[PDB]
Amino acid sequence: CQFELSGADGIVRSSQVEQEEKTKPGQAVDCIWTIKATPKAKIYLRFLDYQMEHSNECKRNFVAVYDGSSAIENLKAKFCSTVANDVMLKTGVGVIRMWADEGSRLSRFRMLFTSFVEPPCTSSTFFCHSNMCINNSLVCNGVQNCAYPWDENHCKLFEQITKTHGTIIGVTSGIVLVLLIISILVQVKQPRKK
Amino acid sequence: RSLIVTTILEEPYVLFKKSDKPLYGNDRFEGYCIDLLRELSTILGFTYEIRLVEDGKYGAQDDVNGQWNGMVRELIDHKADLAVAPLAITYVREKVIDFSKPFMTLGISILYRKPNGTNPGVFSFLNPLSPDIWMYVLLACLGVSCVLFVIARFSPYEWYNPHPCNPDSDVVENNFTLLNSFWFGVGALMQQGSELMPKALSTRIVGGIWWFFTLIIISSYTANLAAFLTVERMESPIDSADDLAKQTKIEYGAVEDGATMTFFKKSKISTYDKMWAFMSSRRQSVLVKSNEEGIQRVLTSDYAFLMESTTIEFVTQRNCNLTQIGGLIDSKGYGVGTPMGSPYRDKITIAILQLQEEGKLHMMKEKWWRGNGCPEEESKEASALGVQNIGGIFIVLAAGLVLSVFVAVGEFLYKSKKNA
Amino acid sequence: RSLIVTTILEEPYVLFKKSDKPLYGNDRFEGYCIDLLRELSTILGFTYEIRLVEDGKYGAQDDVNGQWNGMVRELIDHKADLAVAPLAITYVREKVIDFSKPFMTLGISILYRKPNGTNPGVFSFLNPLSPDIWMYVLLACLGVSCVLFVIARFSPYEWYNPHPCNPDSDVVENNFTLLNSFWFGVGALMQQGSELMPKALSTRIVGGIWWFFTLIIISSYTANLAAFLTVERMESPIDSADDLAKQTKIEYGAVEDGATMTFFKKSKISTYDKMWAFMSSRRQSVLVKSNEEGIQRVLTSDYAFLMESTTIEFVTQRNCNLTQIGGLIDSKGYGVGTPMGSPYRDKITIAILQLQEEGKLHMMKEKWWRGNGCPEEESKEASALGVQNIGGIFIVLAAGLVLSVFVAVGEFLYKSKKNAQLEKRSFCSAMVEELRM
Amino acid sequence: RSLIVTTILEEPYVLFKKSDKPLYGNDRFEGYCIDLLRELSTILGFTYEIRLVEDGKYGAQDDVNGQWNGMVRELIDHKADLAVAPLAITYVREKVIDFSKPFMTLGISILYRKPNGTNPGVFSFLNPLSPDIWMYVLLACLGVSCVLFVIARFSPYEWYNPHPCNPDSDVVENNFTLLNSFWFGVGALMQQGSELMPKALSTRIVGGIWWFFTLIIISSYTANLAAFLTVERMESPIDSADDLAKQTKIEYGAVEDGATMTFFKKSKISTYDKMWAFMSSRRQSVLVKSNEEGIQRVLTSDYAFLMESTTIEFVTQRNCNLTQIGGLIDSKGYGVGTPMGSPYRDKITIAILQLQEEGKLHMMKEKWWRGNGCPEEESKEASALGVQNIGGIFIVLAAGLVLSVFVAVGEFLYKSKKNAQLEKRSFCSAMVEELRM
Amino acid sequence: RSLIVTTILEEPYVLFKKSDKPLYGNDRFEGYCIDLLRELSTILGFTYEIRLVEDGKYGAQDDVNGQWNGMVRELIDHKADLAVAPLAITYVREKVIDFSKPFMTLGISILYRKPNGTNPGVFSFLNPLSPDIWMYVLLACLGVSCVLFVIARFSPYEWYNPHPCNPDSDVVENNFTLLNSFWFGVGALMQQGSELMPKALSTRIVGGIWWFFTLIIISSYTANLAAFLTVERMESPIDSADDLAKQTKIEYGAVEDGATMTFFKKSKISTYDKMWAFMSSRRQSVLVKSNEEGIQRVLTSDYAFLMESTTIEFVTQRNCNLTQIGGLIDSKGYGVGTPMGSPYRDKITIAILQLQEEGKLHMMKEKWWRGNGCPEEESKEASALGVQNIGGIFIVLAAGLVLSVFVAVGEFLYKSKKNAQLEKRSFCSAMVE
Ligand SMILES: *[C@@H]1O[C@H](CO)[C@@H](O[C@@H]2O[C@H](CO)[C@@H](O[C@@H]3O[C@H](CO)[C@@H](O)[C@H](O)[C@@H]3O)[C@H](O)[C@H]2NC(C)=O)[C@H](O)[C@H]1NC(C)=O
Ligand SMILES: *[C@@H]1O[C@H](CO)[C@@H](O[C@@H]2O[C@H](CO)[C@@H](O[C@@H]3O[C@H](CO)[C@@H](O)[C@H](O)[C@@H]3O)[C@H](O)[C@H]2NC(C)=O)[C@H](O)[C@H]1NC(C)=O
Ligand SMILES: *[C@@H]1O[C@H](CO)[C@@H](O)[C@H](O)[C@H]1NC(C)=O
Ligand SMILES: *[C@@H]1O[C@H](CO)[C@@H](O)[C@H](O)[C@H]1NC(C)=O
Ligand SMILES: *[C@@H]1O[C@H](CO)[C@@H](O)[C@H](O)[C@H]1NC(C)=O
Ligand SMILES: [Ca+2]
Are C99 and C336 in contact (CB under 8 A)? Predict the structure, then answer.
């Protein structure tokens, strides 16, 4: 069930098992993910939704992140609690695992990874945070993909016509007033003394 | 020894601590209701087994079965001990449990959205003047017009000679007719004035006094309008429990058959029997699922929800967009359970009283109920006036125009008929 | 056997059934606590006799002997089995006695007279300007009018040629009479403007200076009125003890040695700490040794006089001029004292919870607090602005009308005597001639 | 003998000498502490060799073994006995190390984007009424004027006998043209009056309604403008920590765990406790990790960024828009670390006291802070109200005058080419005739 | 064994207890410094007898025989011990006795009276609009009137043949003369207007634009004056040492034989030499005997004063008339006295640092320098206006009358000389008739 997930950014889908390997929830389930950034780029992992509700103890259900290849050499962090910190993948190879144990009703594991933390800044790339020039197309792509707001963040006469119906009633009154003016000119030029 | 306390996952009472590394043992839980228990252990001497209940359920029996699913079971079957958690001291439980003395009181109160500064805009005018004066100014204008006319007729100096170059004529000119006096009266109210200025020092006194009265009126109206638009304080439509009854426009509600309905049922004060009659009338949406959806539907529309006082004192501190209109209606007491006949009662009530009258309880309550507080809804009065604030004048103008057309055609036919 | 029930005498709690003939037994005593006792005795089915406590006080531990007093003492030594009185629940008392669950709660809230129903001002036309300015303006109006007249009499560009037929305007007057100049000055002052419009520079400069003076005066007046009204509107009445903390113009109050001052000194919360410091600094400057004298001190000055909530409810219902502000600073209940060991406490607790579930004790409370509560409904303090009482007097208009009528009739008499040359002769003819129009 | 001193690279304190040709040893450093050590050497006669800690950190207690690193580590050991660099004097750093008197004073203080300016739009005079009523007002003026004109041209009352002494002639007409009615309406809207006197019922009633409209519009405009000015004038910009604490919109912050936020962590004071509560409520929404990132955050947003005083001075005097707000929340001293058993501690305390007595180190403050401490004070920004930068658009007058002269010359040509029926015939005659008179 | 603590009687540091009779014993000095001493004793473990010094002194050097009158004198004799009290950390004192790490820091600061706002006459009424717009408006009025006059000549129809009742003669005559054009302008600025309103079209646009300008100006003026008259943010003239270092309306101060000038003399520094030169000039009203005299003098005159950074805080937090302005100038230290080589030096410095890191010292400072606090200076902007605030318009009016009279007699003699010779007798008859 090890599914590759590599590029510049992406979302590890919340409980992506129904289509890759549709496993029965009765048996314990687990699927690992491998991440590769662009050449010469490290990874930043930021959870967007995470709730392992069925316990605050971890012999059954949890999510873990390992650095480098998918080996036991050095666990970056296994997260077993309400909240989940962001993490820095020193290497360029990602490891994401979730262990479930007849607890498939777990809310989700859902995160987002951003590449190019290592890349030195250049005119082509964008600075958001300290050693975080990440731009290949990432500038304001609709996702909060930098450590705190900075990158995708607040980069970006007809108003008076766009009224709900004040403009409509105003222009109806304007037609009335044009009728009035055109009528007025008639007796501007028509009548005289007596 | 060790004691099996029992709590529940209420919102600001006992909630899982927020951390990242795993928590082990009795350090997972966190809240006011369990640090109360910590103080109790410090003053008495305990040993903690904070074990939750089977299924989240305040102990409430089933009449047919005769079982007591909830904390009542673990307080009866001795599989637990004192169950420090919000547990209303009600009559039916008291037979088969023992409750300590309450450590805080309760009651059911209203919940409503505070008003926001959007004036009706129909007539946002005549506000900075009582309508009494608005009527008096018109009737005084009529009175001064009439008296000015009367003074004008009974005067020697109010008669001009038309054709003044010809001194052989009559003196019929008076510059004051049945309508001219009224016209000048109204025209001096608004700071332009007609061209019918008096000539006799007997009526120019009236002119001057009328000028003074209108100057004061206008220069005070402007001041009052500026005062209202500068320091504006909006007030609630309803401000009492009784006001909800005999109103029949707010369409309040309550939780479906929870604890509020239990009170309103059988409540024979009859000040809330009208309340219950209206609730049971529209028993499709006024009685709603739970507290979250209740406050949701309150946020949606005018909906005076009705629930326990402490959860109000909590949720109105986070979402400072609502208000606790009214005071108190009833009183319950959250207590500390204990098995029937256990000696903990008399050894724990004394500790509760010690904490209560030693002053730590109020700080304990405030440390959890506080929240952010009251934000800066105080310096906010920077907005341009719009049609939502000035709309009546255009309506008055249209009415004046149509009345002008009507009276114009009427007078035209009047004169033509009189000639014919 | 029967039950020997002790009791205390208190204003709204236990009273004497007001009677003339001598009655005795458990019938002299009548009150809310008596209602509760009768109800719970009917519920629990007992027979009772009533005895007042002789020493006549709640009771406290006398340190010199470590021995109880009053109610607590007469209860501890099994002389009496029950005590249906507002016996407060507290640490020192609970350690020796046994109570039920409280049949009511209370607090320590703030007495305060409602602010005299939004005190109105009358004859406030001229409030924003001190009277000296008004007198100066009147005198300056007179002076500039007469000066305008004087230069309007001695200068070349005065005489007006009415017809365009090169005539000689040898008339004594052309455009300025004393009344006309005076009332042009007044009209220019009053923002309406008149027709006596100057031509010569000599009068033009006077007119310009006068107009500038009028704009300064009127704009100053309007701004001052807006300032007064916004200052009045901005201030807010006190509605919490925290306002009593920050604000210090009004004064607190307390019955020291009544454990309220003791509550404040023993407290550690910021606002109560600073108010306790305030009373300590004042040290009988604002302090009270009873209730009624404190009530009167509130009735005579901006006095807070913090009191327990129940008596505050009673007072603010008997009277209608002083009402509580804020909520409940502190909480503490009441009870029904029973000895250290009594199989009556469990059933009395069951009964109190029963009555509370039916809410009957609320009915007795409203019968005795609200029962005397609202037979003297005064008003609702109608809240509005721009009312006729404040800056809405029309009496100056009436004075103008009166003086106009008098002046009109006076100069009509002048037109009669000095221009028809006969008294009581031109009267009837003149008024008949001029009445038809 | 020769002594050894160990320092740190810092922003204003100990910089490496800026040059292109190589520089060496004691002659390759510059800044504050180098000058201070130079004066200490001149006042005590040392032989100092300067060097850095390979770790290059303040040095702090490490919980892995209870050991230390950096200056503290090498100073408990013996590689040097002096450290002339900002090294906060704290309990953990005082238990083992020996410190001299503080030669400078520190403190955590907030930093804030100063009020940038008024940011005035010259059309701010047009602000109090929304840009929807104005077109309503203009179109209503057109409509009311045209209705007045059309009524005045059809009425059995309006037509008037012209002659001043009229013996029943037959030359009657009205006086209302399009221009007359239009400018009557404009004047009434403008409150300066007009020339026409409405006579019939219809014209007078429409005039009265129009007057009522104009009066309330003008009064509401003045009221709203006064509202803006008197609600802006009573705004209170933040000037202290507690006043900041009451405020909510401006998010807080600090460099996390840099011994600054920890002060809020372990504090006991109520105001700082609620500060820390807000800190924890936001919790990496606003808690910056590095100084310069927070600096840019405050530049581009509203923020506080509580950080130590000296760096705030070094930044504010090296930039603009940033204002030192408030005072000194805490108190630390910058000593000169020494080992326990050493004679130089007392000698150096005497030396630096002598330095501080003369104000010499205040002059070092001037040199490394103030010499570049007023290169960016553009002005002192004399504050007041009622300037031409707000509501001072005279360009309206310019447009009016140019349009008026354009239409004037256009109609001047019109009356010659068309009304005189021939062009160029009477140009020069017209100018001469209307010029020489 | 107990300690031999010494203490000087400084007011907001040590105090004789409020009550007297049931309080007899040499353990009844209390105050902030006493709180520090007691907490120090608890955290260290010892007892102290608080013996007052025989001669009231911080301590001071005496040149004649090295005498050190004050607690310093006996503090080298070892007759006493740790002496918590105000005691500077100056160079000369450190030479003979040891010190500790200061428990607070202070300097010299400016003491001055709070602004009051008895605002002047003439300036006050036209204050709202800044003097720029006033002259802009006068010039604009002159220019608008002049251009109206210019366009009047070019106007086609203003030529209106007076009395057109007889068209007999084409007497084409004028209106909108330059004099009356300026009159129309100046009477249009003020909200009354003449009767010479435009009777043509091209001039009517100028009239309308002028009317709009007048309305905008008057409404804005009223709004801004009603703004100033309900907020009234008073402003202080001096706000820094260099600020009053160059003015002369405000006078400096000092304390007789006070350390303030001792530092402030031989300043050698950029700006402070100037004010020492000034007080050197008038050394008769600058100095006062002690701090209390300076307080009284600043309460009397417009008298800027120069005491320390703490006593200013103590005085200004109990008498809400003064105000601490500027900031710090110098830095000194308050520590604890002790003889050389005593074991208590580091043992007390560690405790003081511990307390200062715990925040205890801040709580003691706040509680012993709190006072009632600054009162509510808010609910008082209800002031009926008086001549004190608008009076200048009356002077303007008087100037108008006098200039009017002078111009009237001038134009009278102008007409007279248009008629007859310089010597006047007939015009006397004209005046009499
Ligand atoms: C407080 O400010 C908000 C901001 O606009 C306003 O609340 C508004 O309240 C009204 C009802 O009081 C909402 O009207 C709508 O009515 C329809 C009727 O079917 C219903 O479907 C909607 O769900 C809603 O109830 C209006 O939407 C709501 N505004 C917003 C933005 O939700 C109002 O100005 C202030 N509140 C009050 C009670 O005046
Ligand atoms: C604000 O109000 C205070 C309180 O009245 C004003 O203080 C007054 O200041 C003047 C100096 O401008 C003092 O004048 C002095 O008077 C004494 C005797 O009265 C005389 O011996 C001195 O030579 C000097 O002339 C005046 O005494 C003082 N008021 C009091 C009650 O002492 C203050 O001027 C007002 N304005 C400001 C801006 O502070
Ligand atoms: C209300 O009346 C009482 C006495 O009748 C008086 O003492 C009090 O001052 C009045 N209220 C106010 C606000 O003046
Ligand atoms: C308040 O009203 C009550 C009776 O209505 C009475 O005490 C008195 O008239 C008032 N007391 C005041 C104003 O102090
Ligand atoms: C106003 O403040 C903003 C802060 O983002 C700044 O960019 C801008 O330059 C300022 N404007 C002026 C006129 O100072
Ligand atoms: Ca006018």
Answer: yes
DSSP string for B301-334: SS--EEEEHHHHHHHHHHSTT-B--S--S---EE
Nearest CA in chain D to E347: D95
Choose the mutation target among C205, C225, C275 for the interface with E, i.e. most E CBs under 10 Å.
C205
Asked whether residue C203 falls in the same domain as residue C258, the answer is no
Surface-to-core class of residue B31, CB atoms within 10 Å of its CB (0-12 exposed, 13-18 middle, 19+ buried):
buried
Rounded to whole angstroms, how far apart are CA atoms B414 and E197? 36
Q: Which of D301, D302, D321 to mutate to test the pocket of ligand 5 (most atoms within 8 A of CB)?
A: D321
Sort out which chain D residues have CB atoms less than 8 A from B407's CB and list them: 201-202, 205
Structure tokens at A135: 């731009």
Chains C and A are in contact, defined as 3 or more C-beta pairs closer than 8 angstroms: no
Among residues C199, C217, C234, which one ends one of the domains? C234
Tokens of B226: 């500026």
The answer to whether E304 and E251 are in contact (CB under 8 A) is yes
Please state how this structure was obtained: cryo-EM
Cβ of C290 less than 6 Å from ligand 3: no
The total number of structural domains in chain A stands at 2
Contacts of B212 in chain C (CB under 8 A): 190, 396
Q: Decide: B344 and B81 in contact? Cβ < 8 Å.
A: yes
- Between CA C385 and CA D203 the distance in angstroms is 35
Q: How far apart are CA C28 and CA C33, in angstroms?
A: 13
The amino acid at residue E92 is V
Q: What pairing do the DSSP bridges indicate for beta strands E47-48 and E2-3?
A: parallel
Alpha-carbon dihedral B312, B318, B322, B326, rounded to 10 degrees: 30
Resolution reached, in Å?
3.9
User: Amino acid identity, residue B241?
Assistant: A
- Is E226 strand, coil or helix? helix
Secondary structure class of B414 (helix, strand, coil):
helix
Query: Under a CB-based contact definition with an 8 Å cutoff, are residues C239 and C114 in contact?
Result: no
Q: Is the dihedral of CA C53, C58, C63, C68 positive or negative?
A: positive
CB E97, CB E340: distance < 8 Å: yes
Q: Please give, rounded to a whole number of angstroms, the shortest distance from the CA of B324 to a CA of chain C.
A: 13
From chain B, the residues in CB contact with A166 under 8 A are: 387
- Ligand 2 pocket, E249 CB below 6 A? no
Q: Tokens in use for D209?
A: 């309604």
- Which among D189, D215, D219 is positioned nearest to D128, based on CA atoms? D219
**Which of B366, B382, B411 is the last residue before a domain boundary?**
B366
CATH code of the domain covering residue C281: 3.40.190.10
Range of the domain at A21: 3-114
The set of residues, in sequence order, having a beta carbon less than 8 Å from that of E33 and lying 6+ positions away, is E7, E10, E13, E14, E84, E85
Q: Is residue C383 part of a domain?
A: no
Query: Is residue D418 assigned to a domain?
Result: yes
Token output for B405: 């057309």
Ligand 3 in reach of C115 Cβ (< 6 A): yes
Phi, psi for residue D352 in degrees, rounded to 5: -70, -30
Closest protein CA for atom 39 of ligand 2: E116
Q: Give φ, ψ of C420 to 5 degrees.
A: -120, -10
State phi, psi for D430 to the nearest 5 degrees: -65, -50
Distance of CA B373 to the CA centre of its chain: 19
Give residue ranges with CB within 6 A of ligand 5.
Answer: D 116-117, 119, 300
Residue B47, by phi and psi: left (phi above 0), alpha (psi -120 to 50) or beta? Answer: beta
Closest partner residue to E205 (CB to CB) among D105, D359, D400 is D400
For residue B227, the enclosing domain spans 120-232
A80 and B22: CB-CB below 8 Å?
A: yes
Which residue's CA is minimally distant from atom 11 of ligand 3? C116
Q: Distance of alpha carbon C192 from its chain centroid, rounded?
A: 41
For residue C116, which ligand has an atom nearest its CA? 3
